[PDB]
Amino acid sequence: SMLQHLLRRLVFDVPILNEFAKMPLKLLTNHYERCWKYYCLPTGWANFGVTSEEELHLTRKLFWGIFDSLAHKKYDQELYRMAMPCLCAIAGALPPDYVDASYSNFDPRPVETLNVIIPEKLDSFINKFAEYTHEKWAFDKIQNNWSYGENVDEELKTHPMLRPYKTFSEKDKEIYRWPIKESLKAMIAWEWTIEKAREGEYNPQPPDLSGVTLSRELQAMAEQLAENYHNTWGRKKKQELEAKGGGTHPLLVPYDTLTAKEKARDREKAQELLKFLQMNGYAVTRSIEKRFAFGFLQQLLRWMDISQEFIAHLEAVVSSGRVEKSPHEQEIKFFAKILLPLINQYFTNHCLYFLSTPAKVLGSGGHASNKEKEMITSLFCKLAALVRHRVSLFGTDAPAVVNCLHILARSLDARTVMKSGPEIVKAGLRSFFESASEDIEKMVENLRQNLTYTTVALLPVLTTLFQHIAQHQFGDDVILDDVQVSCYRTLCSIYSLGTTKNTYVEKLRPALGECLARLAAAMPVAFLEPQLNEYNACSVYTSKSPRERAILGLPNSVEEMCPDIPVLDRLMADIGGLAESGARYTEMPHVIEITLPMLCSYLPRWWERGPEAPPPALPAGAPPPCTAVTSDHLNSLLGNILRIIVNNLGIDEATWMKRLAVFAQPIVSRARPELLHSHFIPTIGRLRKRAGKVVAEEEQLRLELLVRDEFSVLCRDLYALYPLLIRYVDNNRAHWLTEPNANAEELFRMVGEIFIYWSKSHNFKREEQNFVVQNEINNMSFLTADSSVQTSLIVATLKKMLPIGLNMCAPTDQDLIMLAKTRYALKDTDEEVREFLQNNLHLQGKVEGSPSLRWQMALYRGLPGREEDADDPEKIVRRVQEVSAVLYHLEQTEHP
């Protein structure tokens, strides 16, 4: 708050960019990284308060001065290495929407008006207003509660020279009109003229009050008049101030830069003159644009036009050799060092509101301007064209360029690109879609450098566009008409390459599968049902009449354009048969990398628009295309997982293991607990079954490389199967807590046994951590439901399943068993704790021991599924031993 004077001193010399002006720019950089919310249109925080009404505009003027000094300046690296992050921080330190409040060394240039001959055709107004200024000065005194004294006296605080007009001397009237004469000459010198539209021409009865509003242009008249007043005042003050040679007046700052609180001195006079002109009736004749939101993007346009033309020149000369000296090499590197960091920082920082609209419900205020986002869309198309087949040609900043294009892909709504906006940019983005799909077709027919350009720039960014549209639920509003046709042909081109069995395509198949899955999620016609596509309104045949389908030769069905995608009726059965039958990657390596990608495409299988749940598209189509209910797909997935893992345990399938762990995310919505039990218990039971030997072989050898390999695949299978089991019971535990399920407690024992095996086996902990870092496991992702690490799944699964194993045991003998488990470390083995199990039954808890025990036992016996089978002497020891052991290893994990 008290550094605004320091900033006012810094703006005098910092934009000049002297030799010693760089460190102050670094100080600005740090001071601007700090207090970041304090400078903002809303209130940041109370640690230092809120910014003034104009210090934001001081920052804005700083940014523009530094930017213009940057432009066409010497290209020295250290000259601006520290200063480009300063531009990033300054741009991020102020909001784009309503960037400046009350918008509109340093030498205030006056207006040369004495040279020109002034008009005198309106002297009846000139002299009248010149006298009226002093008349209103008198009028202010009666409101101030002071009488006007005739004779000159010092005690009268107002001007004592004032008198009644009968005894008033004009010697002061002929000298007080000089400021009025100067102001009128200033207006005359300005491009704005005065025309007598109307026919006309010591206290004034008519009042001159500036409390009423007026039109924007006519208010800009008064704003510019006050600007001229203040720059003339600054010039006449700095004429005297320049003799000092050091320091400056705090109000010497330009009219736009000074604070609005001190602007009133000139604003009130300008508005009073404006209201006088309005009363006369004289004719005067000469939003998002003013904001940081879009004006800076206007200058971006004025930059990227030059950018595209010079990179076209560069690619032309690199094709026809090279140029010894680039005509504008400084401007060539300018964008690469400034624009790319500035775009990828600024849009990153304010992307919260860039995808916000008044229709949308978001925290940051929406831009509410079609051009604001649509020239951004043009920038998508243009930047694509800047690197279209020229990614390697663009330069070493191509990874930077594609990252900028990626963060651009963030924050896009169809309400600004397709549903509204000029047809030029709409056709540009549609042409981008057509070009990308055509390039994909050419790559997949060649594979049956352009491919390098596609795989580096087009495929990742296209994946991001599809993911963003799918998450924003803009598929219906984006994928339609030409866009939907392009989606059709790129869809059928991606799967067309699936028939290829080459070697160089194997690495690309995961990316194609991911992009195909992304498009499948945001695909709003449900192409998988060709026989029912006529019901959905998003279909090109339903949306466009056959006359509208003739120009592009649309066949009758979506399958007829490209039957590459099989129908859903048999394809699910096809995979559920072939994958079960083969049960090995090596036997059929082609389908493992071809059908599994389209299986990941089928992963976002939605059933909220089918018979299961009321379809949002049901009014559009009464028989909705989605007509799949059973989770046969999911249970076939689980069976395939079991078969392939068990058969190829030794095979280093860790990458596909990771894709399979992240695979089948919407299990809960289609989770059928019966079949899920029937598949999870046998699966995790073979898993822990071989886990028993793996630690056993480790134990015998330790009292090695073979067992470490066994733990390697074991640690692989856990992190590849544990994530899917968590989500299944996250939403089914509540039912089993409410009503005890026999399988639920059994699975508690399974996960407990695997966990305790992990706690016994030091290298199994080692290899678990190894596969955390070898496979880059996102275990925190498994914990967080979208709806060394000390966050492994083997510990997580008990934090998850412990209530199931804890609500089955009423007696509190676990304390004496806990003593036995401490005796484990005190040299009591499994046989000794079996003896303690034998002697446990002579000590049990009582309902009368504690008052809380009464209601605890009340709830325990009021559970509808409670039974005395566990309370029988044979089963009590078993259940309490299981709980005690799992609790053992949980506490020893808990102890650091």
Binding site: A734, L737, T738, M780, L783, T784, A785, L802, P803, L806, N807, P851, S852, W855, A858, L859
Partner: protein
Amino acid sequence: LNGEVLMSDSGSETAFREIEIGDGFLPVCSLGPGQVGHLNLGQDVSSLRFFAICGLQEGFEPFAINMQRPVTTWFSKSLPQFEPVPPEHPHYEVARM
């Protein structure tokens, strides 16, 4: 919420942590204009929902479980009244000359 622990952005189950005990804690609730709400301290366990889902096996007891009579509650009445000027009031001071 409905037996499911609310999730923080960072990924912590505890809404607050490192809380000093100090002098003590009490249940509290505030309602806006035209709002109604049902506060269940837990005098009857049969009337407590989702307590078995979360809290029962974690060692959490219902507030006022063994209490014979319902817990008395205090509400902030909005009737202005005259009270002595506190000596530590930051804005006003009274001197006895």
